[PDB]
Every structure is written in structure tokens, then in C-alpha cells.
Design a protein around this ligand. Structure first.
Ligand code: T27
Ligand code: BR
Ligand code: BR
Ligand code: BR
Lengths: 548, 415
């Protein structure tokens, strides 16, 4: 015989303080028992399991399930209990590759390694914990006891140990053959290259010979699967990729569950279909989680859906990554806190697309949102391509400089250029750094009674102008904003405003252009109409005239 | 040669921290570094039965072209037992901050000469990721004392003392202080002479070794020149209503720090409803109150003391035009240090680079003065900071931080 290299077993432990499983075997029909006896006799012959004595105190239940439309049974060990007691492992996965990060390949071959999947040896010291029992006929004799010698299907550690064992095998081959790529998915190996078909198929045979060192045979009759590949919700082709078919159903009425399913498909589609939107459709899911409940679609939700159907009317494909070319990322504002982007290297050929949604919060502005989207795309790009794309942004260079130089926080955006495609992000107002000479000075104030929630807002100015408005159902904070609003309403195009409201200062210094508070929104619209606004803060209750 | 037993804290498992995304160039750098480290026996490949992880990346130290591996052991360090068995602790030298020149040496490489407790190694697991997860991440653990781990200086302490004994004997006025991978060497010598003593040390250091990649480097500080920021009020001949309002505001704020601050008489100037730009004459009562406040602000804050049992907190404000102010305290209004930066190291168009440099400089000052790092309150959105700070980081330690999302009014008063 030809000696084969043994596969190092991974040492496995149970979680601290925990013992192995001791679970009652379920009774089985005489039919099922016979089926399991034969299966296990065969598995034992192959060395996958071994009979054990009565000394082993552990047990995991075994079942026989009727393979549909057939007379052949299948063996299923329910390792749920053992898995609870088995240590955590390192997910060798680390994440799934994104197709947009893959490189184009002239050839991709599939090798079946199914007869490896079930041949990884199990740590000798852990095998006892995998014990199971075939019940005896009529329960008149001891059940036949077996334990595993290899990684069992359904056991917590099998995927991780399998992947690590196959990686260990493939490492030297990949390392010494840098002109190919190798990827494992389930019980198949995928081998891609740009080599001349001849050189390529030689590589395949060399890999077959390499795998033989560990006694691993691969079927001569080559795989049935061939490009395009259906993989993790994608379609992979030699020189392009897309998502698998997205079909939005026709429906007269929509259920919570249906809407969740709609959003999911739209979210999935959004990574290559430009401009997908889900704001209005997601809004229908707000707060409620009765999966059977029917929700009427708003007129806004209907349009969004119609817009999506149009985007999805015909197939779109992305290209693969060319490391010798720059990555470009372009962003558009869509409205209602929605942003969409495309990443490409060649014009009119996207690697991928995507979207970003405004974070929930009291106040916000387009520039902050644009900034956040940039950081998201940057991070996604590091993951997929290992580098930051150059950005094309719908914001003028001058606008950006005014923003970040004057903003109270540190902020930054990597190398980018202005793209003049409306709607453009702009600054809607900018407060003065110094008090305005010649502009009327409004001293504003407000207060409310916490119990009766009645209040007042008003101002006095250096020109004798005055106003006080009585208010109902209000708060100190609200009256403070209302007072500022009144000063803005009743002043000319240039105005100095003096407030003692730390609350109002905090909001305005955040430079919102849109708010959840309609009062703030009213203030914003007033600010936009002004030529000059200087806001001054003073401490309350210190004898400050005007404000007093 | 024999390992010191090390354990985690009671009822506490190892770190399971996600590796954050790394650029192509950092991955390639780390693959190169770790390949060599593996050949040298410093690290070994690990299996899937090790579920722990600590993030790793790479930096380029100040004034160098070679990559340095940097592990973010912040989580492991929190979970690692405290080390007081041999010594209750290394009383921090109060003299270090008083030297005219302090050079910082990277001696982290020395740690690799000591083996790490066989049972603890698994907790030092880290991952080199692949771009787009196309190949399996490379998994390693340490066989020796890792750089950045709090246990390394603790375990190596006895060895370092022996190494430094002869140099200390020959140079009794030199202050040597170690923090993590850094060695701080302070003297009152002429810089030329100082740099010659530093080089003297490097030699005495090398001698023991028999080469260290970053030992040759030297980062010079001058803590005796480090400046503070007392509260000062404007001196003016003409006060507008606005000027006076700002003065009263600042004094109101100062009165939380200083007891006898009064604004009664000055506030009385703001009696009435005048244009913001109108000049107001100061009354005699107001001038006296202002004068008395000036005097108060010339004094130190009362009841200010450092407590080693409490966290140091650092706040930073962006003042614009590349200027930054900061305060270090343990209790509100009880500042232990305040300062201001202006100098720009090629970051005139990048706020985040500036902030990152400020953080590192503040951390350095804190180490020199109290021998530990502060927890930062950063005026920046989380996502922006997390995306970029590693691009500008040049230190071998990493402090803790949190994020300020609400603009402080106090920014005005530290201007
Ligand atoms: C992740 C991955 C999944 C599959 C297969 C998964 C499945 N099912 C096959 C391979 C070879 C890979 N690995 C890599 C690595 C770098 N570039 C590529 N490019 C690439 C891959 C497939 C096709 C096609 N058709 C074209 C180009 N693939
Ligand atoms: Br099997
Ligand atoms: Br799909
Ligand atoms: Br660009």
C-alpha cells in the first residue's frame, strides 16, 4: 500500500464544569431499528464508528427518518445536548466573500471532496461523549452502543475542525501555485485561474495528486456543476456576477411578514440594483410585530414599491475587481434620509451598489448624513478590496470646507471630488461669529408651570419692540424655543438674539437642517430666510437686564 | 527561561474581540512580520479549538519607514489578573516630569526573550485577515511575552532592573521609568550630552541582548517646559454689551471652580435692553468686582489632589484653526492639568489626524506625570473615529475613549 499522511486531530474539551450528555434514547419501530443496525454495521466497517461497552455512561439519541418518496431510511443523531456542552470554536469562516471583491477568471473547476467531509478523525478523548444507542428489538437485550471516530454530522465542532483540516491540507498547494485561487464550499473545491486551459487542467490534476497524499480521492467523472454557480444568494459567472432572481409578488393586501420579506429582497437586491429604496416600506413595520397583521400601504409606500419594480424590471450585473485600477465611489441623496451609491472602476460598469439610511435621532443635517455614508462605504471597501475608494460627492468643495472648519466636532472625509448632479448637499444657514452692528437685538425668554403646563414666550429689544405670547400644553424647554422662534419671525433680515437657554444652544450649535420637532423645523425655516443671525448665550437669573 | 504562572481574573473568560478591517498594505506588512516571528519561535499557528481573539494592526512609528505590529490588548488587559505578588507596585517617580529632557525608547522587543506561561498563551490569539475573506484568516498565538500586554512589564520587571542596575549606578541622577513597551529616560543634561547618555544606554541595552528593530529611535520630550492654562479674563478699555455678557458667562462658569467669584456688580451693567454692540462704561463697583475676580483666578483650585485609585478623564475641545484645548481630571471642576495645542504636524486639512495626535500627546503627558493613561471623551462621532484613528496612530499603547455627541458650552471658556 501507499502510505498516507495522518491528519492531526484537534484537541476538544467540554465547557468548564460540564459533563457529557446523558439523554434518553427514544423508542423506535422494529422497522427503524433494523435500518439503523445495517447503516451502523456499514459505518463500523468503514471505521467511522465503533461498538463500545456498557461502561460508557454517556448517550445521545438517534433517529431514523423516512427519505421522502423512497423506501430507504437515513440516520440522524440529535447532538443538541452535546453541542450545548461542547466548547466554543473559532469560526474559520470570518465572513463570506463579496462577489464584487472577486477577480475575473478564465476557468473555474469543481472537485468533489464529499468523501473527505466524513473522514476527519475525532479527538480520541472526546469520542466517548458521542455515544449513542440503537434500541433492541422488543427491548429484550441491551441496545447496541456506538461512538464516533470521525467528525459527526450535526456536532458543533465538525464544521470548524473540518475547515481547519482542509485548509491545512490546501495551504502548501495554494502557496506553491500562486497563479490559482482555491475555495471550499460544502463538500466541493473550486479552483480558478487565468492559465491557458492546458496549464490549468494540469494544475487540477496536480491538486488531485496532492490530495491523494492524505488518501483523498476525487471522482474521475468530473462534476456536474458548472458556471454559472448559484452561491450564497448570488450568481457567479466567469466575468460577472449578480444576485439570484428577485421577484416582487403582485398582492392586493400585504401582511407584516410579507412586508418583511419584501424589504429583505429589496435589501438583497440593493447591492447591485441602483437606487433601491425601503424607507416608506420599512415605516410600515414601525413598532408592531404581529406577523399576521395586515397593513394598508400608504400612498408613499406604493410609489416607493412602483419605483422599485421599475428598477427591477430587467437584469443587472456587476463586474469583478481589477486590482490595477482605482476604485470610485459615487453617492446620491435620495430624500427622507436615504442615500444610494455605486462603486466602479470603469464608467457604466459597477462592481456593486448600495444604500445608506439616516440614523434615528432628534436632529440632523445632510452633511452629517453624507459624512456617515462615506464612512460606511469606506469600511465596506476595506473589507472587500482592502482600500479606500476615491469619492464623487454631490457637495461643493467650498461648502465642505466651510462646514468642517466651523463644526464643533472633528470630522473628515477621504480624497474626494465634487460631482454636479442634483440635489446638491449645501449649508442652509450659518450663524455669525460676531454680533451684528446695526441689527436689532432681541432678548428672548420663556417659562412654563410644570403642573398646569401653561407658559409664556417672548422678547424685548433695544428698539422697544416687545412681545409675550401665552401658551398651553407646553414645557420650559418648548417655551425657550418658541421665544427664539418669535424673535426670528418679528425681526428683519439681520438680527442679534440673546437667550439663556442652554437647551436651545445645544440644538442650534449642532446645526440641524431638519428635526423631529416641528418647532425646531420652524426655527430652521426662519433661519434660512435671514441674511445674518448672531445667537448669544447668557446665564439665567443673574440680574442680566433685557433678559431679566 | 522558566515561565511565571499567569491567570485571568476570577469568573472571567478570555477575549473574543472581532478583528476590524485592515487595508491591503497592513495585511501584507503583518504577513511579513508574523512569518519571521514564527520562524523565530515568538508565535505559533493555532487551531480552531482556540476561540479567543484580539485585534491586530500595524503602524509606522514617528520618523520611520518600517512597519510595527501593534496588538490591541485592551480587552485582555482588563481581563488579566493584577500583579502585586513580588511588589505591591512601582511607586511612580514624581521627578520624571521635572527633568529638562526625556527620551522615550521602544524596548518592547526585549519582552520576546521571556517565554509565556504555556497555559496562558491561548488567550493571546490573534488573526491576520484576508482581503474579502477569500482565504482563511491566519491564526497565531504568542509563545513569549507580547508587546502591549500589561503582564509583560510585570513579568519582565525583575529582568529589566538587573539590566539597568549598572547604568543607574554610574548615572545616579538619571530617571528611568518604564510604561508598557516604552522606556522614559530623563535628565537635566545639555541635549548633546543627553543624546550621548541615551546612546550610552542603547549600548548597555544591546550588550545584554547578545537586533532590536526600533531601539535605535529616540523621541525627545521636555516636560519642564510643559505649559498649563490658568483662567484669564480680558483686559479692555471698551466693553460692549456682548463683551460683558461673555465675561459674566465665563465668570459664572469659573464660579463652579472658584468659590468667591462674584458677578452681581457686572450683571448690573447688563441692566436694561441695549444693542449688543453698544459700549457700556464700567461702574466703580463693577471694576472692583472684576479686579477681585482677577485676583481669585491667580490662585490654584482648592482641594485638588490626585488619587491613584480613580480613573483619569481627559476632555478635548476643537477650537479651530488647528488649535485644541484639553483638561485632565478625576472629579468635575477639579482639573489636575489643562493645556492647549496649536502646532500642526501636517494635518492642516484633517481634523481627525489632529485629534488623534492630540490624544497621543495627552496620553504621553499623563504617563509621565501619573504613570497611567486617561479615559478620553472625544469630540467626534464614533464611526468617523473608528474608521480613521488607526491610520494616524504612532504609539505602542492605546487608551480608552468614549464619544461626545452634544456640543459643550464650556468650549467658549477654554478658548
Ligand atoms: C470565493 C470563491 C467562490 C467560488 C465558488 C462558489 C460556489 N458555488 C469559487 C472561487 C474560486 C472563489 N474564490 C475566488 C477568489 C478570487 N477570485 C475569484 N473569482 C471568481 C470566482 C468564481 C467565478 C465564476 N463563475 C468567477 C470568478 N474567486
Ligand atoms: Br458518514
Ligand atoms: Br435572491
Ligand atoms: Br475622485
Amino acid at each position: 500500500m501507499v502510505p498516507i499522511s495522518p491528519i492531526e486531530t484537534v484537541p476538544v474539551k467540554l465547557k468548564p464544569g460540564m459533563d457529557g450528555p446523558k439523554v434518553k434514547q427514544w423508542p423506535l419501530t422494529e422497522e427503524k431499528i433494523k435500518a439503523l443496525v445495517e447503516i451502523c454495521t456499514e459505518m463500523e466497517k468503514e471505521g467511522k464508528i465503533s461498538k463500545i461497552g456498557p461502561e460508557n455512561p454517556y448517550n445521545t439519541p438517534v433517529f431514523a427518518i423516512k427519505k421522502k418518496d423512497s423506501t430507504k431510511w437515513r440516520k440522524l443523531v440529535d447532538f443538541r445536548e452535546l453541542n450545548k456542552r461542547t466548547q466554543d470554536f473559532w469560526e474559520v469562516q470570518l465572513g463570506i466573500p463579496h462577489p464584487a471583491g472577486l477577480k475575473k477568471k478564465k476557468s473555474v473547476t469543481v472537485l468533489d471532496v464529499g468523501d473527505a467531509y466524513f473522514s476527519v478523525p475525532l479527538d480520541e478523548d472526546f469520542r466517548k461523549y458521542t455515544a449513542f444507542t440503537i434500541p433492541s428489538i422488543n427491548n429484550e437485550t441491551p441496545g447496541i452502543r456506538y461512538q464516533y471516530n470521525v467528525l459527526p454530522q450535526g456536532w458543533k465542532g465538525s464544521p470548524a475542525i473540518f475547515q481547519s483540516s482542509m485548509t491545512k491540507i490546501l495551504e502548501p498547494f495554494a502557496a506553491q501555485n500562486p497563479d490559482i485561487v482555491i475555495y471550499q464550499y460544502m463538500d466541493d473545491l473550486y479552483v480558478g485561474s487565468d492559465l491557458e486551459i492546458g496549464q490549468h487542467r494540469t494544475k487540477i490534476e496536480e491538486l488531485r495528486q496532492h490530495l491523494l497524499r492524505w488518501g483523498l480521492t476525487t471522482p474521475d467523472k468530473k462534476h456536474q456543476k458548472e458556471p454559472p454557480f448559484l452561491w450564497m444568494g448570488y450568481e457567479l459567472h466567469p466575468d460577472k456576477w449578480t444576485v439570484q432572481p428577485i421577484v416582487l409578488p403582485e398582492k392586493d393586501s400585504w401582511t407584516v411578514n410579507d412586508i418583511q420579506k419584501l424589504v429583505g429582497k429589496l435589501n438583497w437586491a440593493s447591492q447591485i440594483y441602483p437606487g433601491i429604496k425601503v424607507r416608506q416600506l420599512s415605516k410600515l413595520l414601525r413598532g408592531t410585530k404581529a406577523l399576521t397583521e395586515v397593513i394598508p400601504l400608504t400612498e408613499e409606500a406604493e410609489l416607493e414599491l412602483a419605483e422599485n419594480r421599475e428598477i427591477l424590471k430587467e437584469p443587472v450585473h456587476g463586474v469583478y475587481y481589477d486590482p490595477s485600477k482605482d476604485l470610485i465611489a459615487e453617492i446620491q441623496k435620495q430624500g427622507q434620509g436615504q442615500w444610494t451609491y455605486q462603486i466602479y472602476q470603469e464608467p457604466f460598469k459597477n462592481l456593486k451598489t448600495g444604500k445608506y439610511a439616516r440614523m434615528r435621532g432628534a436632529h440632523t443635517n445632510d452633511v452629517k448624513q453624507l459624512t456617515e455614508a462615506v464612512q460606511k462605504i469606506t469600511t465596506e471597501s476595506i473589507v472587500i478590496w482592502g482600500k479606500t475608494p476615491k469619492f464623487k460627492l454631490p457637495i461643493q468643495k467650498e461648502t465642505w470646507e466651510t462646514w468642517w472648519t466651523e463644526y464643533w466636532q472633528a470630522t473628515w472625509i477621504p480624497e474626494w471630488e465634487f460631482v454636479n448632479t442634483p440635489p446638491l448637499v449645501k449649508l442652509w444657514y450659518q450663524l455669525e461669529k460676531e454680533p451684528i452692528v446695526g441689527a436689532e437685538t432681541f432678548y428672548v425668554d420663556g417659562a412654563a408651570n410644570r403642573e398646569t403646563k401653561l407658559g409664556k414666550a417672548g422678547y424685548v429689544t433695544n428698539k422697544g419692540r416687545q412681545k409675550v405670547v401665552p401658551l398651553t400644553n407646553t414645557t420650559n424647554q418648548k417655551t425657550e424655543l418658541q421665544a427664539i422662534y418669535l424673535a426670528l419671525q418679528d425681526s428683519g433680515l439681520e438680527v442679534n438674539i440673546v437667550t439663556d437657554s442652554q437647551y436651545a444652544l445645544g440644538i442650534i450649535q449642532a446645526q440641524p437642517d431638519k428635526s423631529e420637532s416641528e418647532l425646531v423645523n420652524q426655527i430652521i425655516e426662519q433661519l434660512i430666510k435671514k441674511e445674518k443671525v448672531y445667537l448669544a448665550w447668557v446665564p439665567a437669573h443673574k440680574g442680566i437686564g433685557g433678559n431679566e | 527561561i522558566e515561565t511565571v504562572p499567569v491567570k485571568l481574573k476570577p469568573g472571567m473568560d478570555g477575549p473574543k474581540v472581532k478583528q476590524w478591517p485592515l487595508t491591503e498594505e497592513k495585511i501584507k506588512a503583518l504577513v511579513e512580520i508574523c512569518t519571521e516571528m514564527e520562524k523565530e519561535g515568538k508565535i505559533s499557528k493555532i487551531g480552531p479549538e482556540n476561540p479567543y481573539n484580539t485585534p491586530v494592526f500595524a503602524i509606522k512609528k514617528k520618523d520611520s519607514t518600517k512597519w510595527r505590529k501593534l496588538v490591541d490588548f485592551r480587552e485582555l488587559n482588563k481581563r488579566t489578573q493584577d500583579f502585586w505578588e513580588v511588589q505591591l507596585g512601582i511607586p511612580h517617580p514624581a521627578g520624571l516630569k521635572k527633568k529638562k529632557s526625556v527620551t522615550v525608547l521602544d524596548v518592547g522587543d526585549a519582552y520576546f526573550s521571556v517565554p509565556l506561561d504555556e497555559d496562558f498563551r491561548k488567550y493571546t490569539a490573534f488573526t491576520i485577515p484576508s482581503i474579502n475573506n477569500e482565504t482563511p484568516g491566519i491564526r497565531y498565538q504568542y509563545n513569549v511575552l507580547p508587546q502591549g500586554w500589561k503582564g509583560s512589564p510585570a513579568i519582565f520587571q525583575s529582568s529589566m532592573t538587573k539590566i539597568l542596575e549598572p547604568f543607574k549606578k554610574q548615572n545616579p541622577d538619571i530617571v528611568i521609568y518604564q510604561y508598557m513597551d516604552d522606556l522614559y529616560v530623563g535628565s537635566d543634561l545639555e541635549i548633546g550630552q543627553h543624546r550621548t547618555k541615551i546612546e550610552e544606554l542603547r549600548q548597555h541595552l544591546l550588550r545584554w541582548g547578545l537586533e532590536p528593530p526600533f531601539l535605535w529611535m529616540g523621541y525627545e520630550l521636555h516636560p519642564d517646559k510643559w505649559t498649563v492654562q490658568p483662567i484669564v479674563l480680558p483686559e479692555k478699555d471698551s466693553w460692549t454689551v456682548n463683551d460683558i455678557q461673555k465675561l459674566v458667562g465665563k465668570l459664572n462658569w469659573a464660579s463652579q471652580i472658584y468659590p468667591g467669584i462674584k458677578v452681581r456688580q457686572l450683571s448690573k451693567l447688563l441692566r436694561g435692553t441695549k444693542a449688543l454692540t453698544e459700549v457700556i462704561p464700567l461702574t466703580e463697583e463693577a471694576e472692583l468686582e472684576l479686579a477681585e475676580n482677577r485676583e481669585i483666578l491667580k490662585e490654584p483650585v482648592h482641594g485638588v489632589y490626585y488619587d491613584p485609585s480613580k480613573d483619569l478623564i481627559a476632555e478635548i475641545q476643537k477650537q479651530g484653526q488647528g488649535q485644541w484645548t484639553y483638561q485632565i481630571y478625576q472629579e468635575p471642576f477639579k482639573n489636575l492639568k489643562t493645556g492647549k495645542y496649536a502646532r500642526m504636524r501636517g494635518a492642516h486639512t484633517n481634523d481627525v489626524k489632529q485629534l488623534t495626535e492630540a490624544v497621543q500627546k495627552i496620553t504621553t503627558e499623563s504617563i509621565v506625570i501619573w504613570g497611567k493613561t486617561p479615559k478620553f471623551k472625544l469630540p467626534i462621532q464614533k464611526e468617523t473615529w473608528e474608521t480613521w484613528w488607526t491610520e494616524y496612530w504612532q504609539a505602542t499603547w492605546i487608551p480608552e475613549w468614549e464619544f461626545v455627541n452634544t456640543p459643550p458650552l464650556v468650549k467658549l471658556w477654554y478658548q
